[PDB]
Symmetry: D2
Subunit: 389 residues, 4 copies
């Protein structure tokens, strides 16, 4: 009962930006152009490229593809997901206010809380999953609302169309949705009212655990020109090879995400059936408080499964150490299955008190279910939970 | 009469951070580690690496090498030179003031003037080549002094130790020297009092016109920890492959820069003796107003040659179009020779009024002399100058 | 009614040879080791590597993975598919005989006929699809039988178990199966009696149209030692980067091949019911003469679809140029859909007389169906066939 | 008093094949084109590229550059130096004869001796440094003469122009010069009568110890077409990235080779004056038996320094081991200094009887002097010789 899948997604992921007529050789795969500079027929009159930081063939090809997958007009690539957040923040000026989602990636919390706040910006963390709390927190100085859905790691879900309703009542407020967890194959924030669709491409977009990159998709002409200026002026740009490698991962995004769905759902149901699991948070399960909201704004779910182990910190540790197929490591969205304890690793940059209020306890385990065989993944979780029973 | 060359430079550029025993294969060249994450034996108990953005083998190898070449204790790599400038600015707080050299790369001027100033920072452009003009502009809110030497493109030279004397006289003020034009083989700002040695690694460090990268070297422990926090928190980090490629270019930095010196000097002398060149700005020529300061502050000179062609824009254009070996393009520091007209291209982001005050006119041409054969470079300039003045 | 899928394929494709414990950094993805040489603890006493051509970390990791996907003990990577064919041919001696499948890739035909024959080797092309023709052609000097199944481009299918029975009655004959068209996810020649499972990894193994590489899997110890000697001695070795890129593509082989199956079947059925197609050759259709052998010998089929257009050379040409999503080009097995005219392009190296005997006519069109959206692929073929008629 | 340096060498190494107008972007550095295939406007009507193995932009750019540096009309790149040797051998036919230099790289001797000889080719090893023995050994079946100069590792020098005179009196005999040790910056075999200038590009050509590659430069039109046919037909082709990396190393060949000369000479003079060195073989020293011949055909010398340690095998082992800056490893020609004992390491593939007759004894040490600071390289040799006395 999910949203119908996006129509030409697979065809566009393979061909947008990959036109052979772009190259003299008519190659079917875009070449990796490392050249920092380009010949000009006259001072200031180039043939499309002046300097790699401002633009280069391999990066523009990637931006073209991601924009199409997001239903966007424009896209911008950056050195990392955080670098995209920083560049987006530079759209503002001293005196502006930012409303940020309550549960967000540790680095996003760390940046807003400890860095951006020191340059004339007020940061307010609000649980926008309760949509009235967002409306109450908006102020005449609010210029940017930063949303994750599902949130990392508690996986709270936010009505994007509802928030866009509210946020756009006050005129000039930018709504950003960090769509890293879902990918554009399952959720298109721009089609739901958002002004900016942002990704940590390190996770699902690239999907091969070998490229650190951020992506930002936008439709507004004014908003794109401002973001493009900061891409060149701040210089947090990605390598053209990383762009090629990321564009390479997009070619299989559709088949990868579909398998993440099946394996993730199978893992979530198994964990809810386990006598040694206290709670399971997965947007695809009916037990999720926003399950029905997911189906109206998403075409499916991913392999990100969060759950609470029964017991204490030492039971969580024992489970993670007895894993033989899941790998104890940070990050997510790759072909290999990964397991982690956010309170001690990825979300240790969040204040401990803020962890407790959010539920990020010592027993919260986050899983990034990969593309391995289903029964092998379930046999690994079973043996490791039994080890920690 | 230049400074004696820095000892062990070549050996360190080839071996620092390149320890074969680091790898199970015991390879002599460090592998390219693309992995975004690393397996941990226990929650939070890694093997040296947690996440690629925080750190990764190939990037750490590069940073160590640069640190040794700069005589620094630590170094940080970034996605670009500007990204290093932005990260350095984030060391400050709203209300602080930045003093920037009046003549600087257009993008540096653009960032400070149009971006950093909008976040509670006041920017003042002052001619720190006159070292007393800097002393007058310092205020209790001054936290950062950003200088280029030689400046881009006018190539004004600044007594780094002189500025360091003044700057450190007022307590907690950071002195940054953008050492892009000279490279550590010819100038070590840290040994001259500077607090931060910063590079656009896109130019000479990599030296192969195929990597966009910035580098920041530092000695102060407090200053390093704050920069490292911002490297991971702002995430303007370079690709591990770019890190490998840049470390690859470092291996020939010493032999590349020496040839840049010879070709650059030969081009400057040819242009100075040319009847259709009004003036030549090259730190290696005695005609440069700060020549003796250069020999006092550098072990040599670079391939960056600036000069004024005789006539008007119309002659500047024609000269550039008749070039057959020099390439009309932006950037610099590569093995290939490059020519440009800053007022319209790299420094078009600078306001015309400040361009005029700085001397960046329609006849100022900037050359990045490459590693081609000397005779071919001089014949291309000769043929192009004659073409512009028949 | 196909063979049941191979157990643990996906798990092995993602993890075999990728153990993080190999690296000091504990990286989850193997690094790309470009170093040509390695430090030795003593003159001639290495720690596993002395020189890149003999072996290097990134290549050895890939070989382990491919061997597992083939169920093999050993695997060897090469600079190209032909480079693997040449290296295998060097296993023999002057005076030996080679029996090659009559319908084979043009370059493979060119090598045996025009090169290997000039160095004391007798080459015999036999229709091994009739198993008695192989038995009749075996000679006391026969040392190598080289088979493709399905063949390129006519896609004749060969009973691997039948040929192994025949070939191995005579003692010292090597049976090679070029498994390029099927990939190890759908066909395991080694489990069916073959002595060597060989691939042009340029096609499906890498699957991203950006790596030229060959792979050879083997079980026999004597046969492996002889091949390993020639890998280092002939030096037709691949770059460690290409090895990394190919190993990256292997991680999604299972999900890619499943989509190739679905898209290939849909395209093959559409063409067979098309009024401007005289004949369709697809192992997955019941109309294929060896359909029942395919289901007995394969777990599925791929996106390689061959068909004869009705009319003349001019109708094939017009059809091929009016394709707007399929790309007219050589090669196959990538995420993008490809079309070609073998008689003029990939198989122009086969003698015209031999083309007619094999059926490689001016109206035979070969398709490599990619992973694009199904309806877009069928709509591109529909509009292009009308354009020709 | 050497030959004058080759004119326009540096300019050509930086610009030949690197023309920005080749690319729509007008990039100053050629892009890395990984695409295996290319779009064709009509069946068999390409725009210069059909399939990566036959040709691709990044490889063709490299081939143009090397050809110019060799003073050649054509150049062909291969997966390795041995792969280039194999491809050149396939130029012949069963019944032909090969004359190979008596002292040659272990792998080159091993290939001819143990592989090529098994396919209807007779191999004859002759000391062509004494030119009368070459004239005597030629036979009506001789079709190819293969020389190294300086030889590896004894570094005997061969009058290339003299041998070309002899071999070309007998009509259709190919003269190959493996110019690996000298690089085209110091020796141009083609300008001295050779028919083929061949390189192991892994050594000085690339010069960064991270690319395994072979190169062959030729002037004869018939000979080039035959080699080009075999490049595509045997498929021992290099990766396009390796081609880019090798072309990148070429840009600094001139400045690298000059420093190898200076450091090599200083090391050769130091070791010859060292009380615990029995002999020093360096083409640049007056003590070299063919020193005056070197100055006749070369513009300079390299960092390859061979010498005999005074004493026994055990002193050579200890010497290699106490080096703290030189690295004990195989290969040569990189920016880093390398030490090895060929009799057991690189030349262990040569038969002992042939080793003893050639002088490759247990006390012969081969050094590849890098680009490190001269004074540090000389104490590394000083301290290590002191330790072994
Ligand atoms: C590091 C992981 N996430 C980083 C992240 C980021 C930051 O992306 P970077 O590529 O690490 O800069 C942004 N958005 C979301 C939703 C994220 O989860 C993690 O949770 O392991
Ligand atoms: C692009 C040019 N310079 C960039 C530059 C930079 C910026 O570096 P990037 O890597 O391009 O971000 C910093 N410092 C100096 C002295 C510079 O010249 C140029 O002058 O052509
Ligand atoms: C080039 C295509 N085939 C190459 C090929 C090869 C040659 O592999 P290469 O890696 O392309 O050299 C071997 N075996 C089969 C079955 C093949 O199809 C083609 O038909 O377009
Ligand atoms: C491996 C070294 N030489 C390889 C070599 C080769 C073999 O080339 P490869 O690229 O290593 O396959 C060919 N010719 C000469 C003169 C060589 O020296 C060595 O001596 O360590």
């Amino acid at each position: 009962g999910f949203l119908p899948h996006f129509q030409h997604f697979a065809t566009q992921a393979i061909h947008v930006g990959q036109d052979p007529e772009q190259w003299t050789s008519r190659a079917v795969v875009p070449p990796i152009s490392l050249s920092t500079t380009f010949k000009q027929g006259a001072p200031g009159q180039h043939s499309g490229f002046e300097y790699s930081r401002s633009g280069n063939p391999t990066r523009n090809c990637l931006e073209k593809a991601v924009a199409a997958l997001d239903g966007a007009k424009y896209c911008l690539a950056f050195a990392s997901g955080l670098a995209a957040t920083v560049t987006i923040t530079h759209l503002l000026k001293a005196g502006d206010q930012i409303i940020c989602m309550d549960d967000v990636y540790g680095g996003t919390n760390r940046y807003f809380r400890q860095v951006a706040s020191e340059f004339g910006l007020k940061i307010s963390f609000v649980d926008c999953s309760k949509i009235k709390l967002l409306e109450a927190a908006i102020t005449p100085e609010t210029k940017l609302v930063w949303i994750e859905t599902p949130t990392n790691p508690t996986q709270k879900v936010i009505d994007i169309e509802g928030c866009a309703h509210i946020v756009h009542k006050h005129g000039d407020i930018i709504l950003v949705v960090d769509n890293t967890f879902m990918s554009p194959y399952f959720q298109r924030p721009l089609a739901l009212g958002a002004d900016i669709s942002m990704y940590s491409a390190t996770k699902y977009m690239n999907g091969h655990s070998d490229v650190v990159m951020g992506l930002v998709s936008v439709n507004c002409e004014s908003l794109h020109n401002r973001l493009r200026f900061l891409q060149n002026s701040l210089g947090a740009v990605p390598s053209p090879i990383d762009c090629y490698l990321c564009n390479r991962g997009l070619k299989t995004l559709h088949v990868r995400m579909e398998k993440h769905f099946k394996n993730g759902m199978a893992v979530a149901q198994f964990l809810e059936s386990n006598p040694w699991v206290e709670k399971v948070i997965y947007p695809g399960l009916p037990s999720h408080p926003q399950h029905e909201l997911v189906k109206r704004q998403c075409t499916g779910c991913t392999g990100m499964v969060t759950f609470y182990i029964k017991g204490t910190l030492q039971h969580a540790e024992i489970f993670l150490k007895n894993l033989k197929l899941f790998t104890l490591a940070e990050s997510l969205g790759g072909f290999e299955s990964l397991a982690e304890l956010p309170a001690i690793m990825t979300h240790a940059s969040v204040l401990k008190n803020d962890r407790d209020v959010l539920g990020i306890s010592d027993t919260l385990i986050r899983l990034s279910v990969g593309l391995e065989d289903e029964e092998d993944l379930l046999e690994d979780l079973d043996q490791a939970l039994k080890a920690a029973h």
